[PDB]
């Protein structure tokens, strides 16, 4: 007695992560004298925008977009014909691998199991403004000579090819590659489709 | 209850002035070391609180 | 009083308690009463409280069938004024006779007379009913006090 | 990022942000209440 | 325009010359002929008199100027009663709390709303939206006449 | 019937409050008569509207590391699991005190009313903060010695044991227990650590 509560603690699994991902742990609590389980807290949920408010909304609700045959999992044929329903298709191999970023049944939970956990990639846009915004000596701009000379000469170096591609894309005005716009040009509410 | 004193006249002054709007002077008289010097600093000690 | 409004009074009582047992401080009597459609003078209340000084005014306790009878024992009332009474009784700062009233002086009467208002009480009743020279149109200051 | 435009614009699990993804809502009244928000302080502050 | 109602009985009939009606209010609390002095605007008093009759005028204006100050107190207490309109059952809740204090700092839904709560927009906002439109217009009008 | 609404809420109400009288035993708790859902409505309760754009989606902004039922929930079987893994606790005695914020599906459409029930559930600010903020006078606080005099001499008198434990604990902050904060330790705007 003091026990029936603890019987019940096991249906968490029966629809979240565990039925794919014992990877994402059920964490054992509940020591029978039930004064005890006040030690089991997850203290400190903060960093930069983990659910960013124009992204992870969409991802999850693109389960209701990416589940095409409306089964409740995501097949090889789900990701495909749903990308075809937008446009640019991956080959079945590219898809196969993109499914194999999980062990098999990428359903509603396995989907977000790999989605959230992957917290790393590219730099944040406000860091990317700091990229050239920390080089300027006032409130001003960036002299074009200095952005050309740097990309080729300094530290990690580009090829000519690497600069010229970046240069037809690069918004030159007043001999000054006003950096703030080019940063938004590369990474804002960016392109679809490439994942999931 | 506020009677003959440099104070007494000084609250007569302090009340009337503000009613009547005629400005007020308090002027001691009389000879050497007759406490002009002090009865002044009383008008000072009066209005200060 | 009807049970209806008396229930509202039961609450205006109930709210204002100390040790948690149906006990209101003497102090609170008139103020609660004032909200309850009444303006009982401190002198009026002091009669029906039994002349405390500040000490046992702050210390002595009411309970509901001391409060609600008091409410009533003022509420059915004798002299309580109207516009005509209060235009004369607020021509009460006319300085020459002017149809407009004295700014500092309306504050002072409120400190200086009977039921001595604090500075706080004085300023609140008066403020912004004067003009640039500090003349208050009493003909209106009257209706302001008499309804609200 | 500059070499990433030249190279890293290329995986399968990164560039999925728009087309049918602004159709998931939770941004409408914000677009107005960003511009109105700026006017909201521009109205509050100048008044006070 | 102060002593007025020392004689609530003497003055009636709406309005009344200043100067004269003052003799009517002043007589009604004895205010002896030799001790108060009338000019155009100023009144003057002898030692001892002004002021115990100002004081005793507080005692004899009572009737309407205390019932003036009363209306004020009224009008104000309506707005200002506050302080004790409260504690009763919440004090008894301190006792609910206290019988359980051993288990109080010991609490379930504590802090997990608010550190990632600078980083987000969409806030109170639906409460806002309707009332924000109302707020937008009002804020304009009030700035205008200032 | 409508007891169906109440079986879904003998699941979800039960979310308030049927076993709540725990160590202080077997109280007259939440009733089965349907009108009384609105005595469970006591002060300290804010619940944001359905297509919230987001004060409700902020619960998605943490969702990942909480949930059970991920088509997207926390059931009976998830505060009669999750609090033993997230915020506090329960004996069969205090069972559905805390587990009375989920004896039945906290759907996302109920995450809504669980951070709703966070800023609501257990006697929240208008009760707790004001328990002493009403004994208090103003921009103030309550005196230490006078609060000792209370706890023992006022009402159901407590023991030495009870005072000593609640003495070393009491936030004595300038000869006066910081009552507003002894309660609202549990509340404000700068933490994302416990409960959830």
UniProtKB/Swiss-Prot annotation, chain C:
SMART domains listed in its UniProt record: EFh
Molecular-function annotations in GO: ADP binding; calcium ion binding; magnesium ion binding; microfilament motor activity; myosin heavy chain binding; myosin II binding; structural constituent of muscle
Q: Name one GO cellular component term.
A: muscle myosin complex
Assembly behavior:
Myosin is a hexamer of 2 heavy chains and 4 light chains.
**Could you confirm whether the keyword Transmembrane appears in this record?**
no
Q: Which domain of life is it from?
A: Eukaryota
UniProt keyword terms in alphabetical order? Acetylation, Motor protein, Muscle protein, Myosin, Repeat
Question: Does the entry feature the keyword Ribosomal protein, yes or no?
Answer: no
Q: What does this protein do?
A: Regulatory light chain of myosin. Does not bind calcium.
PROSITE patterns reported in the protein's UniProt record? EF_HAND_2 (PS50222)
- According to the entry, every stretch annotated as the EF-hand domain falls at 4-39, 81-116, 116-148
What is this protein's record name?
Answer: Myosin light polypeptide 6
Protein source organism: Gallus gallus (Chicken)
Swiss-Prot record, chain D:
Q: Which compartments does it reside in?
A: Cytoplasm, Myofibril
Determine the domain of life of the protein's source.
Eukaryota
Q: What does this protein do?
A: Muscle contraction.
Summary of subunit composition and partner proteins: Muscle myosin is a hexameric protein that consists of 2 heavy chain subunits (MHC), 2 alkali light chain subunits (MLC) and 2 regulatory light chain subunits (MLC-2).
The similarity comment for this entry is: Belongs to the TRAFAC class myosin-kinesin ATPase superfamily. Myosin family.
- Reproduce the free-text note on domains from the UniProt record: The rodlike tail sequence is highly repetitive, showing cycles of a 28-residue repeat pattern composed of 4 heptapeptides, characteristic for alpha-helical coiled coils.
Q: What is this protein called?
A: Myosin-11
**Organism from which the protein derives:** Gallus gallus
Q: What is the lineage of its organism?
A: Eukaryota, Metazoa, Chordata, Craniata, Vertebrata
Gene of this entry: MYH11
Parent-protein start and end of this portion: 828 to 852 of 1979
Curated annotation (Swiss-Prot), chain E:
Q: Which residues form the IQ domain?
A: 61-90
Q: Where is the protein found, in the record's own terms?
A: Cytoplasm, Myofibril
Question: Which parts of this chain are annotated as the region Actin-binding?
Answer: 37-51
> Which top-rank group of organisms is this from?
Eukaryota
Family label: Belongs to the TRAFAC class myosin-kinesin ATPase superfamily. Myosin family.
Its annotated function is as follows: Muscle contraction.
Domain comment, in the record's words? The rodlike tail sequence is highly repetitive, showing cycles of a 28-residue repeat pattern composed of 4 heptapeptides, characteristic for alpha-helical coiled coils.
The annotated subunit structure for this chain is:
Muscle myosin is a hexameric protein that consists of 2 heavy chain subunits (MHC), 2 alkali light chain subunits (MLC) and 2 regulatory light chain subunits (MLC-2).
What's the name of the protein? Answer: Myosin-11
Q: Which organism is it from?
A: Gallus gallus
Q: Which residues of the full protein are shown?
A: 732 to 852 of 1979
């Amino acid at each position: 007695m003091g026990d029936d509560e603890k019987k019940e603690k096991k249906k968490k699994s029966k629809k979240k992560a565990e039925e794919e991902g014992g990877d994402a742990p059920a964490a054992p609590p509940a020591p029978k004298p039930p004064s005890q389980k006040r030690r089991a807290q997850r203290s400190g949920s903060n960093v930069f925008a983990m659910f960013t408010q124009h992204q992870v909304q969409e991802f999850k609700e693109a389960f209701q977009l990416i589940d095409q045959d409306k089964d409740g999992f995501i097949s090889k044929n789900d990701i495909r014909a749903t990308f075809d329903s937008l446009g640019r298709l991956c080959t079945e191999q590219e898809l196969d691998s993109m499914v194999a970023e999980a062990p098999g049944p990428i359903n509603f939970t396995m989907f977000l199991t790999i989605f959230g956990d992957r917290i790393a990639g590219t730099d944040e846009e406000d860091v990317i403004v700091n990229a050239f915004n920390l080089f300027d000596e006032g409130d001003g701009k960036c002299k074009e000579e200095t952005l050309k000379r740097s990309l080729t000469t300094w530290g990690e170096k580009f090829s000519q090819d690497e600069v010229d591609q970046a240069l037809s894309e690069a918004p030159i005005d007043g001999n000054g590659l006003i950096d703030i716009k080019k940063f938004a040009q590369i990474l804002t509410k960016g392109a679809k489709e490439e994942g999931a | 209850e506020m009677p003959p004193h440099i104070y007494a006249i000084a609250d007569t002054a302090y009340r009337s002035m503000l009613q009547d709007r005629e400005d007020q002077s308090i002027l001691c008289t009389g000879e050497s070391g007759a406490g002009k010097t002090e009865n002044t600093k009383k008008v000072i000690q009066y209005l200060a609180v | 009083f009807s049970e209806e409004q008396t229930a509202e009074f039961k609450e205006a009582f109930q709210l204002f308690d100390r040790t948690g047992d149906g006990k209101i401080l003497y102090s609170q009597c008139g103020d609660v009463m004032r909200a309850l459609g009444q303006n009982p003078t401190n002198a009026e209340v002091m009669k029906v409280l039994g002349n405390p000084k500040s000490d046992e005014m702050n210390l002595k306790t009411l309970k509901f069938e001391q409060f609600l009878p008091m409410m009533q024992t003022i509420a059915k009332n004798k002299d309580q004024g109207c516009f005509e009474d209060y235009v004369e009784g607020l021509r009460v700062f006319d300085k020459e006779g002017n149809g407009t009233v004295m700014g500092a002086e309306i504050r002072h009467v409120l400190v200086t007379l009977g039921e001595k208002m604090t500075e706080e009480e004085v300023e609140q009743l008066v403020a912004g009913h004067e003009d640039s020279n500090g003349c208050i149109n009493y003909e209106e200051l009257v209706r302001m006090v008499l309804s609200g | 990022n500059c070499a990433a435009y030249l190279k890293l614009r290329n995986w399968q699990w990164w560039r999925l942000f728009t087309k049918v993804k602004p159709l998931l809502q939770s941004a409408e009244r914000e677009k107005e209440m960003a511009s109105m928000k700026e006017e909201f302080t521009r109205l509050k502050e100048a008044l006070e | 325009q102060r002593y007025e109602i020392l004689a609530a009985n003497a003055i009636p009939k709406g309005f009344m010359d200043g100067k004269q009606a003052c003799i009517l209010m002043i007589k009604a609390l004895e205010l002896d002929p030799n001790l108060y002095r009338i000019g155009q605007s100023k009144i003057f008093f002898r030692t001892g008199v002004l002021a115990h009759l100002e004081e005793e005028r507080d005692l004899k204006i009572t009737d309407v100027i205390i019932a003036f100050q009363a209306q004020c107190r009224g009008y104000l207490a309506r707005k200002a009663f506050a302080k004790r309109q409260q504690q009763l059952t919440a004090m008894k809740v301190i006792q609910r709390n206290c019988a359980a204090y051993l288990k109080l700092r010991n609490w379930q839904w504590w802090r997990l709303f608010t550190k990632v709560k600078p980083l987000l927009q969409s806030a109170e906002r639906e409460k806002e939206m309707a009332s924000m439109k109302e707020e937008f217009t009002r804020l304009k009008e009030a700035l205008e006449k200032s």
